[PDB]
Amino acid sequence: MVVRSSEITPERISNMRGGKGEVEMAHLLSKEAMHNKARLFARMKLPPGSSVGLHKHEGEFEIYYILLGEGVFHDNGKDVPIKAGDVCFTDSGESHSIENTGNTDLEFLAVIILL
Amino acid sequence: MVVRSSEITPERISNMRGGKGEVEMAHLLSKEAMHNKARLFARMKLPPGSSVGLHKHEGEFEIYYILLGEGVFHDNGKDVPIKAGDVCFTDSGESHSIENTGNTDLEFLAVIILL
Numbered sequence: 013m014v015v016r017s018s019e020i021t022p023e024r025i026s027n028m029r030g031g032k033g034e035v036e037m038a039h040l041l042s043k044e045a046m047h048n049k050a051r052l053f054a055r056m057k058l059p060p061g062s063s064v065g066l067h068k069h070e071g072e073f074e075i076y077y078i079l080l081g082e083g084v085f086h087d088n089g090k091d092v093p094i095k096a097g098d099v100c101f102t103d104s105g106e107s108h109s110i111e112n113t114g115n116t117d118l119e120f121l122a123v124i125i126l127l
Numbered sequence: 128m129v130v131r132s133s134e135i136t137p138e139r140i141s142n143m144r145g146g147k148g149e150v151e152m153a154h155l156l157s158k159e160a161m162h163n164k165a166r167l168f169a170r171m172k173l174p175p176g177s178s179v180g181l182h183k184h185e186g187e188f189e190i191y192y193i194l195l196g197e198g199v200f201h202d203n204g205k206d207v208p209i210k211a212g213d214v215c216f217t218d219s220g221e222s223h224s225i226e227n228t229g230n231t232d233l234e235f236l237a238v239i240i241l242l
């Protein structure tokens with residue numbers, strides 16, 4: 013199958029994981045589609061000023077691929093500035109967050125893979 | 128960890144899986160780092176006229192997320208026009224290919240998840 017991102021209605025989430033402002037999440041493939049091996053495959057849009065709040069992953073890991081804009085990725089107690097083209101990897105047992113510190117939308121892909 | 132795409136030296140590959148022309152692949156995360164749950168997380172670049180040739184996947188599935196450009200994704204005997212923002216899903220037992228039928232570069236993420 014092909015899924016045209018452009019044509020998936022995002023869910024608007026306020027204070028996602030305790031973050032700032034409103035964020036949009038477009039689910040691109042279901043976990044069932046992904047044979048229960050990954051539980052999330054989504055495109056996130058963070059308006060200027062918004063963030064996904066600090067939260068922990070256990071028994072899984074998450075990858076962000078930054079698609080557009082700029083911001084700051086927090087992982088293992090460190091802030092790292094990120095931009096389009098960056099991969100952010102969060103391992104099992106770590107906590108992370110991400111904030112849009114620029115003036116255009118920060119978009120990225122998020123994939124959570126089990127165990 | 129953060130991995131900055133632009134700073135990875137791609138591997139140049141001619142006639143990838145029997146395709147046309149020469150493509151570039153940047154491996155972004157190793158299988159090890161992904162706990163042996165995925166065997167590939169790469170950013171591919173196809174110049175116009177180039178393709179990843181037809182090939183079969185077994186015991187795993189693969190996702191392309193299109194980054195830039197346009198082209199044609201072949202799956203289950205059908206040619207499907209794709210463009211930036213599209214997700215291409217190839218399930219286990221299926222065969223796929225992708226060709227840059229456009230006039231600029233076609234870039235995409237490829238992830239192969241096991242079982």
Ligand SMILES: O=C([O-])C(=O)[O-]
Pocket residue numbers: 052064074122
């Ligand atoms: O949903 C999550 O875990 C995320 O987006 O980081």
Ligand SMILES: O=C([O-])C(=O)[O-]
Pocket residue numbers: 144179189237239
């Ligand atoms: O090598 C593969 O499986 C691919 O890139 O589609």
Ligand SMILES: [Mn+2]
Pocket residue numbers: 067069074108
């Ligand atoms: Mn997370």
Ligand SMILES: [Mn+2]
Pocket residue numbers: 182184189223
């Ligand atoms: Mn393939």
